[PDB]
Amino acid sequence: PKMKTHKGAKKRVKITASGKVVAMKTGKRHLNWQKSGKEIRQKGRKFVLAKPEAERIKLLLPYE
Amino acid sequence: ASEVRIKLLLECTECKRRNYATEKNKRNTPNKLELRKYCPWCRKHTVHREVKI
RNA sequence: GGGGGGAACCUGGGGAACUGAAACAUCUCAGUACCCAGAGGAGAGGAAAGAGAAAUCGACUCCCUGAGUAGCGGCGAGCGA
RNA sequence: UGGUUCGUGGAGCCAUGGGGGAAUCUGGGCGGACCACCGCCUAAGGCUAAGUACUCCGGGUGACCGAUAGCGCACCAGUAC
RNA sequence: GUAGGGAAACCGAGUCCGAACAGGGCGCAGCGGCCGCAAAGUCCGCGGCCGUGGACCCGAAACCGGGC
RNA sequence: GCUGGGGCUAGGAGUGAAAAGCUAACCGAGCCCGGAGAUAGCUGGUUCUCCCCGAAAUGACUUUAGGGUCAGCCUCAGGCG
RNA sequence: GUGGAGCCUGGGAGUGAGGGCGCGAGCGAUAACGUCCGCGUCCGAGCGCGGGAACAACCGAGACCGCCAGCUAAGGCCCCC
RNA sequence: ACCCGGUGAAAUUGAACUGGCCGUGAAGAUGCGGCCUACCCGUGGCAGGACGAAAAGACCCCGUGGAGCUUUACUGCAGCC
RNA sequence: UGAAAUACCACCCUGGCGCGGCUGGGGGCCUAACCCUCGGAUGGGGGGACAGCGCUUGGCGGGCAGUUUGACUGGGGCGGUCGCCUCCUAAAAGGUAACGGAGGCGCCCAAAGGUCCCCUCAGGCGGGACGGAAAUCCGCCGGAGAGCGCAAGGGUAGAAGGGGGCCUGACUGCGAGGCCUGCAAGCCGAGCAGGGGCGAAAGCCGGGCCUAGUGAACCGGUGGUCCCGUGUGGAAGGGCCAU
Ligand SMILES: [Mg+2]
Ligand SMILES: [Mg+2]
Ligand SMILES: [Mg+2]
Ligand SMILES: [Mg+2]
Ligand SMILES: [Mg+2]
Ligand SMILES: [Mg+2]
Ligand SMILES: [Mg+2]
Ligand SMILES: [Mg+2]
Ligand SMILES: [Mg+2]
Ligand SMILES: [Mg+2]
Ligand SMILES: [Mg+2]
Ligand SMILES: [Mg+2]
Ligand SMILES: [Mg+2]
Ligand SMILES: [Mg+2]
Ligand SMILES: [Mg+2]
Ligand SMILES: [Mg+2]
Ligand SMILES: [Mg+2]
Ligand SMILES: [Mg+2]
Ligand SMILES: [Mg+2]
Ligand SMILES: [Mg+2]
Ligand SMILES: [Mg+2]
Ligand SMILES: [Mg+2]
Ligand SMILES: [Mg+2]
Ligand SMILES: [Mg+2]
Ligand SMILES: [Mg+2]
Ligand SMILES: [Mg+2]
Ligand SMILES: [Mg+2]
Ligand SMILES: [Mg+2]
Ligand SMILES: [Mg+2]
Ligand SMILES: [Mg+2]
Ligand SMILES: [Mg+2]
Ligand SMILES: [Mg+2]
Ligand SMILES: [Mg+2]
Ligand SMILES: [Mg+2]
Ligand SMILES: [Mg+2]
Ligand SMILES: [Mg+2]
Ligand SMILES: [Mg+2]
Ligand SMILES: [Mg+2]
Ligand SMILES: [Mg+2]
Ligand SMILES: [Mg+2]
Ligand SMILES: [Mg+2]
Ligand SMILES: [Mg+2]
Ligand SMILES: [Mg+2]
Ligand SMILES: [Mg+2]
Ligand SMILES: [Mg+2]
Ligand SMILES: [Mg+2]
Ligand SMILES: [Mg+2]
Ligand SMILES: [Mg+2]
Ligand SMILES: [Mg+2]
Ligand SMILES: [Mg+2]
Ligand SMILES: [Mg+2]
Ligand SMILES: [Mg+2]
Ligand SMILES: [Mg+2]
Ligand SMILES: [Mg+2]
Ligand SMILES: [Mg+2]
Ligand SMILES: [Mg+2]
Ligand SMILES: [Mg+2]
Ligand SMILES: [Mg+2]
Ligand SMILES: [Mg+2]
Ligand SMILES: [Mg+2]
Ligand SMILES: [Mg+2]
Ligand SMILES: [Mg+2]
Ligand SMILES: [Mg+2]
Ligand SMILES: [Mg+2]
Ligand SMILES: [Mg+2]
Ligand SMILES: [Mg+2]
Ligand SMILES: [Mg+2]
Ligand SMILES: [Mg+2]
Ligand SMILES: [Mg+2]
Ligand SMILES: [Mg+2]
Ligand SMILES: [Mg+2]
Ligand SMILES: [Mg+2]
Ligand SMILES: [Mg+2]
Ligand SMILES: [Mg+2]
Ligand SMILES: [Mg+2]
Ligand SMILES: [Mg+2]
Ligand SMILES: [Mg+2]
Ligand SMILES: [Mg+2]
Ligand SMILES: [Mg+2]
Ligand SMILES: [Mg+2]
Ligand SMILES: [Mg+2]
Ligand SMILES: [Mg+2]
Ligand SMILES: [Mg+2]
Ligand SMILES: [Mg+2]
Ligand SMILES: [Mg+2]
Ligand SMILES: [Mg+2]
Ligand SMILES: [Mg+2]
Ligand SMILES: [Mg+2]
Ligand SMILES: [Mg+2]
Ligand SMILES: [Mg+2]
Ligand SMILES: [Mg+2]
Ligand SMILES: [Mg+2]
Ligand SMILES: [Mg+2]
Ligand SMILES: [Mg+2]
Ligand SMILES: [Mg+2]
Ligand SMILES: [Mg+2]
Ligand SMILES: [Mg+2]
Ligand SMILES: [Mg+2]
Ligand SMILES: [Mg+2]
Ligand SMILES: [Mg+2]
Ligand SMILES: [Mg+2]
Ligand SMILES: [Mg+2]
Ligand SMILES: [Mg+2]
Ligand SMILES: [Mg+2]
Ligand SMILES: [Mg+2]
Ligand SMILES: [Mg+2]
Ligand SMILES: [Mg+2]
Ligand SMILES: [Mg+2]
Ligand SMILES: [Mg+2]
Ligand SMILES: [Mg+2]
Ligand SMILES: [Mg+2]
Ligand SMILES: [Mg+2]
Ligand SMILES: [Mg+2]
Ligand SMILES: [Mg+2]
Ligand SMILES: [Mg+2]
Ligand SMILES: [Mg+2]
Ligand SMILES: [Mg+2]
Ligand SMILES: [Mg+2]
Ligand SMILES: [Mg+2]
Ligand SMILES: [Mg+2]
Ligand SMILES: [Mg+2]
Ligand SMILES: [Mg+2]
Ligand SMILES: [Mg+2]
Ligand SMILES: [Mg+2]
Ligand SMILES: [Mg+2]
Ligand SMILES: [Mg+2]
Ligand SMILES: [Mg+2]
Ligand SMILES: [Mg+2]
Ligand SMILES: [Mg+2]
Ligand SMILES: [Mg+2]
Ligand SMILES: [Mg+2]
Ligand SMILES: [Mg+2]
Ligand SMILES: [Mg+2]
Ligand SMILES: [Mg+2]
Ligand SMILES: [Mg+2]
Ligand SMILES: [Mg+2]
Ligand SMILES: [Mg+2]
Ligand SMILES: [Mg+2]
Ligand SMILES: [Mg+2]
Ligand SMILES: [Mg+2]
Ligand SMILES: [Mg+2]
Ligand SMILES: [Mg+2]
Ligand SMILES: [Mg+2]
Ligand SMILES: [Mg+2]
Ligand SMILES: [Mg+2]
Ligand SMILES: [Mg+2]
Ligand SMILES: [Mg+2]
Ligand SMILES: [Mg+2]
Ligand SMILES: [Mg+2]
Ligand SMILES: [Mg+2]
Ligand SMILES: [Mg+2]
Ligand SMILES: [Mg+2]
Ligand SMILES: [Mg+2]
Ligand SMILES: [Mg+2]
Ligand SMILES: [Mg+2]
Ligand SMILES: [Mg+2]
Ligand SMILES: [Mg+2]
Ligand SMILES: [Mg+2]
Ligand SMILES: [Mg+2]
Ligand SMILES: [Mg+2]
Ligand SMILES: [Mg+2]
Ligand SMILES: [Mg+2]
Ligand SMILES: [Mg+2]
Ligand SMILES: [Mg+2]
Ligand SMILES: [Mg+2]
Ligand SMILES: [Mg+2]
Ligand SMILES: [Mg+2]
Ligand SMILES: [Mg+2]
Ligand SMILES: [Mg+2]
Ligand SMILES: [Mg+2]
Ligand SMILES: [Mg+2]
Ligand SMILES: [Mg+2]
Ligand SMILES: [Mg+2]
Ligand SMILES: [Mg+2]
Ligand SMILES: [Mg+2]
Ligand SMILES: [Mg+2]
Ligand SMILES: [Mg+2]
Ligand SMILES: [Mg+2]
Ligand SMILES: [Mg+2]
Ligand SMILES: [Mg+2]
Ligand SMILES: [Mg+2]
Ligand SMILES: [Mg+2]
Ligand SMILES: [Mg+2]
Ligand SMILES: [Mg+2]
Ligand SMILES: [Mg+2]
Ligand SMILES: [Mg+2]
Ligand SMILES: [Mg+2]
Ligand SMILES: [Mg+2]
Ligand SMILES: [Mg+2]
Ligand SMILES: [Mg+2]
Ligand SMILES: [Mg+2]
Ligand SMILES: [Mg+2]
Ligand SMILES: [Mg+2]
Ligand SMILES: [Mg+2]
Ligand SMILES: [Mg+2]
Ligand SMILES: [Mg+2]
Ligand SMILES: [Mg+2]
Ligand SMILES: [Mg+2]
Ligand SMILES: [Mg+2]
Ligand SMILES: [Mg+2]
Ligand SMILES: [Mg+2]
Ligand SMILES: [Mg+2]
Ligand SMILES: [Mg+2]
Ligand SMILES: [Mg+2]
Ligand SMILES: [Mg+2]
Ligand SMILES: [Mg+2]
Ligand SMILES: [Mg+2]
Ligand SMILES: [Mg+2]
Ligand SMILES: [Mg+2]
Ligand SMILES: [Mg+2]
Ligand SMILES: [Mg+2]
Ligand SMILES: [Mg+2]
Ligand SMILES: [Mg+2]
Ligand SMILES: [Mg+2]
Ligand SMILES: [Mg+2]
Ligand SMILES: [Mg+2]
Ligand SMILES: [Mg+2]
Ligand SMILES: [Mg+2]
Ligand SMILES: [Mg+2]
Ligand SMILES: [Mg+2]
Ligand SMILES: [Mg+2]
Ligand SMILES: [Mg+2]
Ligand SMILES: [Mg+2]
Ligand SMILES: [Mg+2]
Ligand SMILES: [Mg+2]
Ligand SMILES: [Mg+2]
Ligand SMILES: [Mg+2]
Ligand SMILES: [Zn+2]
């Protein structure tokens, strides 16, 4: 039977034009009152997942 | 943070938006904080007041 | 006129668990296995109190596709129009 | 409560076990809570070929088996035991 | 497959954050003599590995259904 | 009290002067067939030949510790040089 | 310094029970064929070969095949030899 | 039991051309070293050894294995209010 | 005449009364639903709108069901431990184990933060009413042995220590380049722009001398935004930024 798209991955991650995998920095969901502004700000960007981890996530997204 | 050392937000007094989170001791510092801060909405420093987190 | 039989198939009335979730309860397995009733050479469905955005289509059934999309989901495992 | 992708979700729709309970086209249901507008459709009676499923049965055909294989059984086998 | 960026509206070789014409993230740009050659890509075959299936074979103790 | 014949009560059920006894020669939940090829991070087994290379038994994390993910270490193909 | 060196992209792993020895420590008793780390080695996978009486890891030395040829290594040269 | 006539099993079994000591070896050697001893083959007997046979240790631990039982573990259900 | 003023007719209040409708709660009685029972049954007797039974509410509930009941460990249990910081072990880069040797953290500070300016310690001897080993004062010596909120370590008076003035940079938008590193995290950060603080200026300031003072994701709350809104306009609900 065909592979199914993993919905937690589709909801967290995007495959870029060249196939890198991109996700939001973790760590400002909460407990933020004492975090610096440099911290909150920097966690507000996307980062590019480490190759071996991205490579795995990419396989769960067979039809993007 | 503790029961006595609380977290609180600082609200811009001109446009009413909370722009900063910080902390204080409410035994040592019972009056509501008033601090001049840069409001990114207003694009200028503005007296901000402690408002409940 | 009925009754009883018929390998699979079919509808309806009931309906598990192992298992998976690398534990488990929701979830899954699965409306499956199985019991029961009923039909018949098929059965079911069928002639819009429909679809759903087109100023549209035009009963139902069956195949391809739409699409593992939309969504659903201890937003987990998975499920899936 | 079930059905739907929908696990209570903003949860409509279809169905209905309990309670309440109308109207007959100026009636009613629907387009995903609700309201308006704009549209779609006519519930609470019934039937309806074909295209579809199956293989006990008959036949055709195998880059299928060839007696430890192939059906459990090539043979008097659902037998002896 | 031929466009990406953005939660989205949306814009588009850009776009997102941003007040920014700042900075940054993610993106955009063949060979020979018009000819041929190669190629994005995509289709089919073959092979390796992966996912779903009992998924390399054999083995529980057990659980559940219906019967005896 | 013992005993013949004829009967009734069974599977989370019977029956028990109670031993978790007995319910067709193994009962802390009977047997048969089915779900079913349950599951088994465990044990075992894994079949012709030559040729080249050739490990690991560590780190991090892990209801993890005799299992995994990543990394380290082996090998192949392409590129660099 | 041209090596089964190195770097880059990718495909496939296996491993994630180690062990002895030397040196440096901790633990232990300045015990263990003890235990736990570090550097190194070997066995693992070199239970193939010589020496060590025998003997994975001590000494010698990395077995492509053949020879009734030569030189050596550790160790040996009285007889077993 | 033994001898002669008749009939004639069994578990077990890698193969066997299957001695003692002192050593060595995965730490209890017929199978390795050195020694000692020993002609070939049986019959009746004994049980020290072949870590003899049987039974994939029942103790112990391990498995995010099972099952019976308990309760002011969790969560539900019958039942009762 | 007071706020409003008088006879008389209304519409409506404050509170109360009696009639009535419509009802909720209790008490009594009835009979015919419903239940029981009676040789006799379209009836009699008894219970009686209770009980039973349907739907729904909340509760009690090992009677039963499904399960859960951690790991490390010189076997397991028992005890102890589990994250983070500091020192040692650690073999002079980094790293490095043991149920090895010792201690700390889970806070705090509106100043204990920024900046400008000023100041310098502990301790010893001598001197000085109450006054002491040690209160405050004077002299000399005294480089740091004191201080630095808390453990330890590193650092440090050419201040990070102590005092004062003005202040809120305990910034918003970013961020070259690195440390560390399996991942994810963690860490440092020049510079540019906006709007500020201190300073004459040079300049400093994106919390604290430093290293602990912490928690991914899921689900949800609140403020903002005004991005999506199931034919359409809204709305429901979501996204996004902040927490
Ligand atoms: Mg976050
Ligand atoms: Mg979170
Ligand atoms: Mg948030
Ligand atoms: Mg939130
Ligand atoms: Mg801080
Ligand atoms: Mg932090
Ligand atoms: Mg900050
Ligand atoms: Mg802040
Ligand atoms: Mg597609
Ligand atoms: Mg694409
Ligand atoms: Mg019939
Ligand atoms: Mg019939
Ligand atoms: Mg059915
Ligand atoms: Mg029926
Ligand atoms: Mg049913
Ligand atoms: Mg059925
Ligand atoms: Mg059942
Ligand atoms: Mg289950
Ligand atoms: Mg299964
Ligand atoms: Mg699975
Ligand atoms: Mg499971
Ligand atoms: Mg499992
Ligand atoms: Mg279990
Ligand atoms: Mg389950
Ligand atoms: Mg399954
Ligand atoms: Mg189901
Ligand atoms: Mg079937
Ligand atoms: Mg029939
Ligand atoms: Mg037909
Ligand atoms: Mg028909
Ligand atoms: Mg019909
Ligand atoms: Mg009609
Ligand atoms: Mg498509
Ligand atoms: Mg999810
Ligand atoms: Mg389903
Ligand atoms: Mg309903
Ligand atoms: Mg449902
Ligand atoms: Mg929802
Ligand atoms: Mg719904
Ligand atoms: Mg109804
Ligand atoms: Mg009408
Ligand atoms: Mg109407
Ligand atoms: Mg309707
Ligand atoms: Mg309706
Ligand atoms: Mg409607
Ligand atoms: Mg409609
Ligand atoms: Mg319609
Ligand atoms: Mg019909
Ligand atoms: Mg026809
Ligand atoms: Mg038909
Ligand atoms: Mg046919
Ligand atoms: Mg045939
Ligand atoms: Mg033939
Ligand atoms: Mg034969
Ligand atoms: Mg046969
Ligand atoms: Mg033959
Ligand atoms: Mg036959
Ligand atoms: Mg036969
Ligand atoms: Mg026969
Ligand atoms: Mg750009
Ligand atoms: Mg760029
Ligand atoms: Mg091609
Ligand atoms: Mg693969
Ligand atoms: Mg299968
Ligand atoms: Mg298979
Ligand atoms: Mg496979
Ligand atoms: Mg099996
Ligand atoms: Mg059993
Ligand atoms: Mg069970
Ligand atoms: Mg059971
Ligand atoms: Mg049964
Ligand atoms: Mg039964
Ligand atoms: Mg009798
Ligand atoms: Mg009898
Ligand atoms: Mg009897
Ligand atoms: Mg009985
Ligand atoms: Mg019985
Ligand atoms: Mg029975
Ligand atoms: Mg049973
Ligand atoms: Mg029980
Ligand atoms: Mg049972
Ligand atoms: Mg019983
Ligand atoms: Mg008895
Ligand atoms: Mg007992
Ligand atoms: Mg039997
Ligand atoms: Mg018996
Ligand atoms: Mg049982
Ligand atoms: Mg029995
Ligand atoms: Mg059966
Ligand atoms: Mg199954
Ligand atoms: Mg199977
Ligand atoms: Mg299991
Ligand atoms: Mg095989
Ligand atoms: Mg080699
Ligand atoms: Mg290990
Ligand atoms: Mg390791
Ligand atoms: Mg860690
Ligand atoms: Mg980890
Ligand atoms: Mg394991
Ligand atoms: Mg790997
Ligand atoms: Mg290498
Ligand atoms: Mg190459
Ligand atoms: Mg080369
Ligand atoms: Mg090599
Ligand atoms: Mg190599
Ligand atoms: Mg590789
Ligand atoms: Mg391969
Ligand atoms: Mg592996
Ligand atoms: Mg392994
Ligand atoms: Mg391991
Ligand atoms: Mg080991
Ligand atoms: Mg080791
Ligand atoms: Mg090693
Ligand atoms: Mg070890
Ligand atoms: Mg060593
Ligand atoms: Mg030496
Ligand atoms: Mg040593
Ligand atoms: Mg040491
Ligand atoms: Mg001694
Ligand atoms: Mg040795
Ligand atoms: Mg050792
Ligand atoms: Mg030693
Ligand atoms: Mg030692
Ligand atoms: Mg070693
Ligand atoms: Mg090995
Ligand atoms: Mg060697
Ligand atoms: Mg080697
Ligand atoms: Mg050797
Ligand atoms: Mg040898
Ligand atoms: Mg060898
Ligand atoms: Mg040797
Ligand atoms: Mg030798
Ligand atoms: Mg020798
Ligand atoms: Mg020759
Ligand atoms: Mg010579
Ligand atoms: Mg020599
Ligand atoms: Mg000699
Ligand atoms: Mg001799
Ligand atoms: Mg004789
Ligand atoms: Mg005889
Ligand atoms: Mg022999
Ligand atoms: Mg002999
Ligand atoms: Mg020895
Ligand atoms: Mg011996
Ligand atoms: Mg011998
Ligand atoms: Mg020999
Ligand atoms: Mg010997
Ligand atoms: Mg000998
Ligand atoms: Mg002798
Ligand atoms: Mg004898
Ligand atoms: Mg004996
Ligand atoms: Mg004996
Ligand atoms: Mg022996
Ligand atoms: Mg013996
Ligand atoms: Mg034995
Ligand atoms: Mg044996
Ligand atoms: Mg077994
Ligand atoms: Mg065993
Ligand atoms: Mg055992
Ligand atoms: Mg036991
Ligand atoms: Mg044990
Ligand atoms: Mg156990
Ligand atoms: Mg567990
Ligand atoms: Mg485990
Ligand atoms: Mg278990
Ligand atoms: Mg159990
Ligand atoms: Mg009772
Ligand atoms: Mg009365
Ligand atoms: Mg009466
Ligand atoms: Mg009456
Ligand atoms: Mg009465
Ligand atoms: Mg009542
Ligand atoms: Mg009734
Ligand atoms: Mg109610
Ligand atoms: Mg209830
Ligand atoms: Mg229980
Ligand atoms: Mg309970
Ligand atoms: Mg289960
Ligand atoms: Mg538990
Ligand atoms: Mg648990
Ligand atoms: Mg238990
Ligand atoms: Mg647990
Ligand atoms: Mg354990
Ligand atoms: Mg112990
Ligand atoms: Mg262990
Ligand atoms: Mg140990
Ligand atoms: Mg021990
Ligand atoms: Mg041990
Ligand atoms: Mg304990
Ligand atoms: Mg410990
Ligand atoms: Mg922690
Ligand atoms: Mg060190
Ligand atoms: Mg050191
Ligand atoms: Mg070091
Ligand atoms: Mg060193
Ligand atoms: Mg490093
Ligand atoms: Mg001050
Ligand atoms: Mg300070
Ligand atoms: Mg100051
Ligand atoms: Mg002094
Ligand atoms: Mg004095
Ligand atoms: Mg005095
Ligand atoms: Mg004094
Ligand atoms: Mg000091
Ligand atoms: Mg302290
Ligand atoms: Mg001022
Ligand atoms: Mg960077
Ligand atoms: Mg990193
Ligand atoms: Mg300035
Ligand atoms: Mg500025
Ligand atoms: Mg100025
Ligand atoms: Mg700066
Ligand atoms: Mg401080
Ligand atoms: Mg601090
Ligand atoms: Mg979750
Ligand atoms: Mg979770
Ligand atoms: Mg949320
Ligand atoms: Mg709308
Ligand atoms: Mg809008
Ligand atoms: Mg709508
Ligand atoms: Mg309007
Ligand atoms: Mg609009
Ligand atoms: Mg409004
Ligand atoms: Mg809203
Ligand atoms: Mg909103
Ligand atoms: Mg956010
Ligand atoms: Mg922001
Ligand atoms: Zn403002």
Measured CA A48 to C1' C73 distance, in angstroms: 27
The resolution in Å comes to: 2.9
**Closest by Cα among A16, A22, A20 to A45:** A22
B23 is written with which tokens?
Answer: 């902390």
**Closest by Cα among A43, A60, A47 to A20:** A47
- Asked if B25 and B33 touch (Cβ cutoff 8 Å), the reply is no
Flag whether residue B7 sits within 8 Å of chain A, measured between CB atoms. Answer: yes
- Tokens 């840069």 — which residue? B38
**Closest by Cα among B9, B5, B17 to B42:** B17
d(CA A18, CA A36): 33
Q: What does each C-alpha distance from A44 to A18, A27, A38, A50, B39 come to in angstroms?
A: 23, 9, 10, 18, 19
Q: What does each C-alpha distance from B52 to A1, B18, B27, B33, B36 come to in angstroms?
A: 55, 10, 16, 11, 18
- Tokens 């007094």 — which residue? B13
**Closest by Cα among A56, A60, A55, A25 to A40:** A25
End-to-end Cα distance, chain B: 13
Exp. method: X-ray
**Residue A7: CB partners within 8 Å, gap ≥ 6?**
none
B40 is written with which tokens?
Answer: 């990114």
Measured in angstroms, how far is the CA atom of residue B36 from the centroid of ligand 51? 86
Strand partners, A14: A22
